[PDB]
Amino acid sequence: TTALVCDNGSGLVKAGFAGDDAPRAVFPSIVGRPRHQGVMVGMGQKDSYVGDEAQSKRGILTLKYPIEHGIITNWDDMEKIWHHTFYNELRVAPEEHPTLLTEAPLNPKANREKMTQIMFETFNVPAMYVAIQAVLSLYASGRTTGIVLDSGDGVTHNVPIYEGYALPHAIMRLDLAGRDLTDYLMKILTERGYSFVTTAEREIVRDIKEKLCYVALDFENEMATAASSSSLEKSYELPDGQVITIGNERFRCPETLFQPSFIGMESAGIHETTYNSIMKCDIDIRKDLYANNVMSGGTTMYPGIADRMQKEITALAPSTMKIKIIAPPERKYSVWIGGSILASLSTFQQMWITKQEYDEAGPSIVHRKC
Amino acid sequence: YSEEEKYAFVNWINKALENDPDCRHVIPMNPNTDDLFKAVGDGIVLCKMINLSVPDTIDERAINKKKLTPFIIQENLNLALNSASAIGCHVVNIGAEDLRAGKPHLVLGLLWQIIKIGLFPEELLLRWANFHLENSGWQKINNFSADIKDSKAYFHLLNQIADDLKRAESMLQQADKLGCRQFVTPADVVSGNPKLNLAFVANLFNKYIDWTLLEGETREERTFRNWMNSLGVNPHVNHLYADLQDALVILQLYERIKVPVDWSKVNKPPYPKLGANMKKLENCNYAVELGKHPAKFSLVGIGGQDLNDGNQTLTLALVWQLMRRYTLNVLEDLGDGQKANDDIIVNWVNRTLSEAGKSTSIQSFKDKTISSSLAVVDLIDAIQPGCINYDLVKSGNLTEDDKHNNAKYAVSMARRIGARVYALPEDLVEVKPKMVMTVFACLMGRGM
Ligand SMILES: Nc1ncnc2c1ncn2[C@@H]1O[C@H](COP(=O)(O)OP(=O)(O)O)[C@@H](O)[C@H]1O
Numbered sequence: 001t002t003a004l005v006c007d008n009g010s011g012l013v014k015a016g017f018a019g020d021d022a023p024r025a026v027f028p029s030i031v032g033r034p035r036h037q038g039v040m041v042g043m044g045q046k047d048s049y050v051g052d053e054a055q056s057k058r059g060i061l062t063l064k065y066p067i068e069h070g071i072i073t074n075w076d077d078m079e080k081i082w083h084h085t086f087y088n089e090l091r092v093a094p095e096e097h098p099t100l101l102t103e104a105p106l107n108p109k110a111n112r113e114k115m116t117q118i119m120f121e122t123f124n125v126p127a128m129y130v131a132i133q134a135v136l137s138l139y140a141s142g143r144t145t146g147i148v149l150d151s152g153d154g155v156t157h158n159v160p161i162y163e164g165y166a167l168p169h170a171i172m173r174l175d176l177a178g179r180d181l182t183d184y185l186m187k188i189l190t191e192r193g194y195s196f197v198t199t200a201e202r203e204i205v206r207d208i209k210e211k212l213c214y215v216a217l218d219f220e221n222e223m224a225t226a227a228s229s230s231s232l233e234k235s236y237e238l239p240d241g242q243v244i245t246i247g248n249e250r251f252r253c254p255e256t257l258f259q260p261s262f263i264g265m266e267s268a269g270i271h272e273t274t275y276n277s278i279m280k281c282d283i284d285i286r287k288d289l290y291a292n293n294v295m296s297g298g299t300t301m302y303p304g305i306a307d308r309m310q311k312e313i314t315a316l317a318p319s320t321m322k323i324k325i326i327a328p329p330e331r332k333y334s335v336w337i338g339g340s341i342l343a344s345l346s347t348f349q350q351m352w353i354t355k356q357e358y359d360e361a362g363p364s365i366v367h368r369k370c
Numbered sequence: 371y372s373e374e375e376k377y378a379f380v381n382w383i384n385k386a387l388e389n390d391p392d393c394r395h396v397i398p399m400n401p402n403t404d405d406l407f408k409a410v411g412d413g414i415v416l417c418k419m420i421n422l423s424v425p426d427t428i429d430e431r432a433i434n435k436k437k438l439t440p441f442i443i444q445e446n447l448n449l450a451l452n453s454a455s456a457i458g459c460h461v462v463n464i465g466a467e468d469l470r471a472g473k474p475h476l477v478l479g480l481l482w483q484i485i486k487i488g489l490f491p492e493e494l495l496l497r498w499a500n501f502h503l504e505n506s507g508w509q510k511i512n513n514f515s516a517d518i519k520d521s522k523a524y525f526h527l528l529n530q531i532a533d534d535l536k537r538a539e540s541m542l543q544q545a546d547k548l549g550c551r552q553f554v555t556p557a558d559v560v561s562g563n564p565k566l567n568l569a570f571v572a573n574l575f576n577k578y579i580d581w582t583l584l585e586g587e588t589r590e591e592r593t594f595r596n597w598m599n600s601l602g603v604n605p606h607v608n609h610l611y612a613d614l615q616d617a618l619v620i621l622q623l624y625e626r627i628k629v630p631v632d633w634s635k636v637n638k639p640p641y642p643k644l645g646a647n648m649k650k651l652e653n654c655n656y657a658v659e660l661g662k663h664p665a666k667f668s669l670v671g672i673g674g675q676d677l678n679d680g681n682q683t684l685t686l687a688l689v690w691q692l693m694r695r696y697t698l699n700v701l702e703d704l705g706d707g708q709k710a711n712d713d714i715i716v717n718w719v720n721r722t723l724s725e726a727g728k729s730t731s732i733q734s735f736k737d738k739t740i741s742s743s744l745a746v747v748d749l750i751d752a753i754q755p756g757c758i759n760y761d762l763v764k765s766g767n768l769t770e771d772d773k774h775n776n777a778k779y780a781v782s783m784a785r786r787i788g789a790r791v792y793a794l795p796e797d798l799v800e801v802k803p804k805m806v807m808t809v810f811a812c813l814m815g816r817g818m
């Protein structure tokens with residue numbers, strides 16, 4: 001039976017077979033609930049929206065994100081999310097198909113245990129596996145040595161891998177990928193006579209961020225250009241009919257990744273995180289780490305993220321040897337493509353978490369099988 | 371661009387969901403239309419699906435008779451989708467709000483549950499089932515688990531070889547003849563489960579040469595009857611003195627010993643109710659005349675009336691002589707001319723078995739090592755490598771009684787490869803040197 005690879009994420013959740021070069025599941029991961037009164041009979045008969053079914057009706061509904069930076073709080077909506085991801089984009093039976101799961105690092109044991117039980121009890125799975133997104137994204141670039149910066153919608157972690165081996169003591173996690181960026185953008189959009197409070201405009205704000213916001217090279221120079229000239233002023237067409245125009249709050253939103261002081265947190269930025277991870281590794285393996293910086297996740301596609309990151313790392317470099325930033329075009333699906341490649345291998349068939357072993361092992365079977 | 375991409379999906383859904391034929395009033399009924407999306411989004415199939423086992427359930431016209439007024443058609447979708455307790459919409463993400471219109475991915479995900487819960491040697495005998503699949507002309511299914519994946523080709527050939535609990539009756543009708551209906555679950559039958567299907571098809575057609583002992587019959591008459599049966603007589607000779615009274619079998623045997631027969635003087639087996647005895651007497655007289663002058667037989671005191679009246683002595687005196695010429699011809703056509711010998715033909719088996727190499731070598735036909743059928747089966751596959759079949763052979767663990775079975779086993783396929791062996795298994799079990807010689811003579815005919 002063909003293996004299945006599912007890439008879960010706070011904003012986008014991916015699924016597909018093992019071996020395919022193109023993704024299948026392309027949908028926002030949102031939850032909506034009815035909130036208006038139906039004067040006509042036959043309406044109000046839904047518990048929770050999931051994904052594009054709420055995206056297409058984002059006027060009369062709310063938006064709920066059950067995934068909070070890779071943390072699974074309410075499993076009732078996550079059941080719906082996984083049901084959406086699997087049957088609507090695989091159409092195969094997981095009950096007789098192996099499925100490869102993704103999970104953010106530094107995840108408490110309760111989350112992994114519960115997502116394992118859900119697979120082994122709500123579903124009837126013959127053999128599952130749980131893999132780290134950063135490790136899987138390394139196979140997409142065709143390399144086995146170097147750090148991978150996986151930045152989704154609320155998860156930003158750096159797992160350095162050297163010749164297949166990973167360093168547990170050099171693994172950290174940052175909760176700033178796309179969600180706090182969206183919050184910062186919708187907060188700063190109110191400085192131009194705009195109102196952004198309800199979640200019905202959150203998808204529009206995210207789209208505006210995706211098609212306007214870009215990582216700037218020099219923030220002070222961008223401030224000077226925006227204050228003096230008015231050349232970086234691009235307009236957006238609101239779905240209802242009004243026209244907005246933002247020129248300063250475009251490159252301000254992506255700058256929060258490098259400057260955490262905008263949202264007020266004591267953690268460092270994304271450029272210092274990989275440097276600190278490398279510093280936590282061996283001094284004889286930094287050569288393979290500076291020249292191998294594979295980008296992935298839903299965040300790092302801003303127009304000017306690679307050059308800015310290269311400049312930031314070069315400023316942090318001791319001016320000894322070259323820095324290489326890898327930004328593949330399929331950064332949105334590097335994790336899924338790598339998982340499909342790994343599951344397609346003949347070796348990967350011999351450590352899936354089978355149900356018969358789980359029956360006598362117990363809930364902690366994923367903890368030493370993954 | 372593309373105007374059509376998925377008409378085959380309609381047929382697939384039909385063959386999968388014929389568990390409930392009432393769903394065919396919502397989904398297309400094999401005419402590849404597009405009625406599925408809107409009505410399935412209303413959940414009508416969910417209430418219909420219960421009619422799989424018992425029709426006494428939510429009726430299609432009882433839950434919905436289209437009192438969905440020309441403005442509000444919003445009442446049927448939630449009313450029918452709330453009855454999704456059966457099978458279970460494992461996609462709990464979707465509500466009846468989005469299913470009001472329907473989405474491709476959502477409909478596919480719900481159809482996934484519909485398909486999943488809606489449904490709950492061997493080859494030598496399988497070919498005796500596949501023989502009828504040819505009909506006018508088409509390929510053969512083989513087992514129900516090998517070639518057919520869906521019900522398309524199976525139903526197409528069922529049109530010629532004519533609820534899954536009742537749709538399995540299509541496969542079981544050829545099994546209901548002997549009562550072998552149960553012990554093969556319809557869910558696995560439709561799903562094409564291999565292991566259940568191989569044995570089920572195999573054991574069915576195991577009963578789809580005559581070696582029996584009559585109450586009164588000498589070994590000589592048994593040899594006669596077996597010889598004529600193995601030579602290919604048009605009737606089936608069961609009694610020597612009751613089937614040769616028409617002299618038709620004798621005439622059939624005549625051309626096989628190179629005696630020309632004029633069939634224009636022979637009365638056909640259809641006999642008028644008047645003068646049939648006269649026609650049979652004429653046939654016997656013509657057979658005697660053909661045996662006398664051009665055939666040079668020694669039959670003193672034998673006439674047509676003796677064969678017509680079934681005189682045992684004179685009939686045996688003719689048949690044994692017929693085999694005398696038949697064996698003479700078999701031993702003469704093998705050589706260059708009119709020479710026949712036993713020592714020239716006894717080392718042939720010793721020489722041709724050295725091509726492969728096996729520990730079977732005989733000195734003559736009187737050796738006791740040919741008491742079992744090991745020597746003949748060692749040679750029967752030397753000429754034809756495709757008949758190895760040592761499954762039923764016995765070597766070193768054979769008693770007096772059990773070697774009859776392997777003797778018959780070795781004799782039976784001799785005609786399969788091409789040796790026109792007219793030998794009883796008993797004559798090979800014993801060390802009768804005259805007729806195992808005929809066995810080897812028939813072997814040499816196909817050998818070279
Ligand atoms: N082209 C883009 N440029 C900038 N940001 C983007 C782009 N595409 C998506 N994003 C942002 O990234 C987040 C989506 O992350 P996601 O796709 O869930 O990551 P992952 O692939 O690791 O699961 C959303 O906030 C979205 O706004």
Ligand SMILES: [Mg+2]
Nearest residue numbers: 008009133152
């Ligand atoms: Mg991700």
